[PDB]
Amino acid sequence: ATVLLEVPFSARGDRIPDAVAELRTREPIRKVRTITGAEAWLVSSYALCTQVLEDRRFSMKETAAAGAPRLNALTVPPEVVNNMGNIADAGLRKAVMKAITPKAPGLEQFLRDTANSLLDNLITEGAPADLRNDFADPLATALHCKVLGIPQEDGPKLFRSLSIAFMSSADPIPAAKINWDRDIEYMAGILENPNITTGLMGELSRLRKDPAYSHVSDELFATIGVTFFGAGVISTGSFLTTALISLIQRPQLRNLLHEKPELIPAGVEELLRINLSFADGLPRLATADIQVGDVLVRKGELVLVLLEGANFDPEHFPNPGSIELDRPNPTSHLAFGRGQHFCPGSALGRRHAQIGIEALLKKMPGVDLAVPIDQLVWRTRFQRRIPERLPVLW
Ligand code: HEM
Ligand SMILES: Clc1[nH]c2ccccc2c1-c1nn(-c2ccccc2)cc1Cn1ccnc1
Domain spans of the chain, in order of start: 1-394
* Ligand 2 atom at minimal distance to the Cα of residue 230: 18
Distance CA 152, CA 185 (A): 18
- Using only the alpha carbons of the chain, give its radius of gyration: 21
Distance CA 17, CA 20 (A): 6
Name the residue among 2, 7, 39 with its Cα closest to residue 23.
7
Contact 164, 172 (CB under 8 A): no
Provide the residue count of the chain. Answer: 394
Buried b or exposed e, range 202-214, using 16+ CB within 10 angstroms: bbbbebbeeeebe
Distance CA 57, CA 40 (A): 16
Query: 267 C-alpha to center of ligand 2: Å?
Result: 29
Distance CA 96, CA 132 (A): 28
> In whole angstroms, how far apart are CA 147 and each of 113, 194, 201, 232, 347?
15, 17, 9, 10, 13
Contact 345, 231 (CB under 8 A): yes
Pocket test of ligand 1: the residue of 103, 220, 343, 386 to mutate, having most ligand atoms within 8 Å of its CB, is 343
Of all ligands present, the nearest one to the C-alpha of 283 is 1
> Residue 337, by phi and psi: left (phi above 0), alpha (psi -120 to 50) or beta?
left
Distance CA 308, CA 11 (A): 13
Distance CA 79, CA 84 (A): 10
Distance CA 76, CA 164 (A): 11
Kindly report the protein residue whose alpha carbon is nearest to atom 7 of ligand 2: 227
Strands 295-297 and 290-292, bridge-based pairing: antiparallel
Technique behind the model? X-ray
Q: Beta-strand (E) ranges in 220-324?
A: 282-286, 290-292, 295-297, 302-305
Superfamily of domain 1-394, CATH level 4 = Cytochrome P450 (1.10.630.10)
Contact 259, 362 (CB under 8 A): no
Ligand 2 pocket, 165 CB below 6 A? Answer: yes
- Phi, psi (deg, nearest 5) at residue 59: -95, 135
Distance CA 190, CA 197 (A): 10
Distance CA 63, CA 59 (A): 7
Q: Helix H segments across 149-192?
A: 155-160, 162-165, 174-192
Collapsing DSSP to helix, strand or coil, 321 comes out as: coil
Contact 383, 164 (CB under 8 A): no
Displacement of CA 166 from its chain's centroid (Å)? 10
Helices 107-125 & 137-148 angle (0-180, nearest 10): 150
Ligand 2 pocket, 241 CB below 6 A? Answer: no
- Phi, psi (deg, nearest 5) at residue 298: -100, 150
Collapsing DSSP to helix, strand or coil, 298 comes out as: coil
Collapsing DSSP to helix, strand or coil, 167 comes out as: strand
Displacement of CA 291 from its chain's centroid (Å)? 29
Q: Is residue 84 a known part of a binding site? A: yes
> What is the stated resolution of the deposited model, in angstroms?
1.5
Name the residue among 283, 303, 305 with its Cα closest to residue 60.
283
Distance CA 306, CA 281 (A): 4
Q: Starting from the edge strand earliest in sequence, which strands make up the sheet with 29-33, in order?
A: 29-33, 39-43, 302-305, 282-286, 58-59
Q: Is residue 223 a known part of a binding site? A: no
Q: What percent helix, strand, coil does the chain show, rounded to 5?
A: 50, 10, 40
Name the residue among 264, 233, 256, 201 with its Cα closest to residue 384.
233
Q: Is residue 59 a known part of a binding site? A: no
Name the residue among 306, 252, 245 with its Cα closest to residue 279.
306
Query: 212 C-alpha to center of ligand 1: Å?
Result: 28
Residue 65 DSSP one-character state: S
Query: 336 C-alpha to center of ligand 1: Å?
Result: 6
Residue 368 DSSP one-character state: E
Distance CA 110, CA 117 (A): 10
Collapsing DSSP to helix, strand or coil, 161 comes out as: coil
The number of CA neighbours under 13 Å toward the Cβ of 73 is 14
Ligand 2 pocket, 227 CB below 6 A? Answer: yes
Residue 336 DSSP one-character state: T
Ligand 2 pocket, 74 CB below 6 A? Answer: yes
Distance CA 7, CA 99 (A): 36
Collapsing DSSP to helix, strand or coil, 209 comes out as: coil
Strands 129-130 and 39-43, bridge-based pairing: unpaired
Helices 346-363 & 107-125 angle (0-180, nearest 10): 40
Q: Beta-strand (E) ranges in the chain?
A: 29-33, 39-43, 58-59, 129-130, 282-286, 290-292, 295-297, 302-305, 368-369, 391-393
Ligand 1 pocket, 93 CB below 6 A? Answer: no
As a dihedral over the C-alpha atoms of residue 92, residue 95, residue 100, residue 103, rounded to 10 degrees, the angle is 170
Kindly report the protein residue whose alpha carbon is nearest to atom 13 of ligand 2: 227
Q: Starting from the edge strand earliest in sequence, which strands make up the sheet with 129-130, in order?
A: 129-130, 391-393, 368-369
Helices 251-259 & 346-363 angle (0-180, nearest 10): 90
Distance CA 372, CA 351 (A): 29
